[PDB]
């Protein structure tokens, strides 16, 4: 269970737009940990790992 720290606008290619304060569920990461595959109310896709953090 994670929260978004900053807005991120999808750059396509299975990335996912997220908004600061939104909750996400994390499925995993890419090979170097820089991208995170996440689920939000808006769908599923890749977001910057550094743009989210655990919450609770």
């Amino acid at each position: 269970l994670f929260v978004a720290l900053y807005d991120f606008v999808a750059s396509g290619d299975n990335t996912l737009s997220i908004t600061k304060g939104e909750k996400l569920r994390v499925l995993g990461y890419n090979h170097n940990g820089e991208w995170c595959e996440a689920q939000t109310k808006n769908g599923q896709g890749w977001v910057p790992s550094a743009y989210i953090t655990p919450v609770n």
């Binding site: 720290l5 900053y6 991120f8 750059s11 290619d13 299975n14 990335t15 990461y29 890419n30 090979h31 820089e34 991208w35 595959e37 890749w46 977001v47 910057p48 790992s49 550094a50 743009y51």
Partner: peptide, 10 residues
């Protein structure tokens, strides 16, 4: 995942 790096945190 994208083959390009993500944006740096602001």
């Amino acid at each position: 995942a994208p083959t390009y790096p993500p944006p740096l945190p602001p």
